[PDB]
């Protein structure tokens, strides 16, 4: 139903995100809003596929390479965990704090 890559319906009107790598599903979490799920796919596909990634949306927080650096600072598994825990955004923002 969703037009967004990676986005699947979940119960209670919620939305899941998933990515496949070589026919292996990786679950990316459950989200209240459709575009939130789509944005979670985008984070995963950027980290998983790099320059080969095709995203739902253009990135809005990578003008200074900060988000690319953040993705490149982590393993795939760490990114997946941040997405599922809904901590990715807060951890990314902390990484932008100036000292």
Swiss-Prot record:
It is found in: Nucleus. Induction: Expressed with a circadian rhythm showing a peak at dawn. It comes from the Eukaryota. Expressed in leaves. Residues 3-58 bind DNA. Belongs to the AP2/ERF transcription factor family. RAV subfamily. Transcriptional repressor of flowering time on long day plants. Acts directly on FT expression by binding 5'-CAACA-3' and 5'-CACCTG-3 sequences. Functionally redundant with TEM2. Interacts with FT. This is AP2/ERF and B3 domain-containing transcription repressor TEM1. It comes from Arabidopsis thaliana (Mouse-ear cress). The lineage of its organism: Eukaryota, Viridiplantae, Streptophyta, Embryophyta, Tracheophyta. The gene is TEM1. The chain holds residues 69 to 167 of 361 of the full protein.
């Amino acid at each position: 139903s969703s037009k967004y890559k990676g986005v699947v319906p979940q119960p209670n009107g919620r939305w899941g995100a998933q990515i496949y790598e070589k026919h292996q599903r990786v679950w990316l979490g459950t989200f209240n809003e459709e575009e939130e799920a789509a944005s979670s796919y985008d984070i995963a596909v950027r980290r998983f596929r790099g320059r080969d990634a095709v995203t739902n949306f253009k990135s809005q927080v990578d003008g200074n390479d900060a988000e690319s650096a953040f993705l490149d600072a982590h393993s795939k598994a760490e990114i997946v965990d941040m997405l599922r825990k809904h901590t990715y955004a807060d951890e990314f923002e902390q990484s932008r704090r100036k000292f």
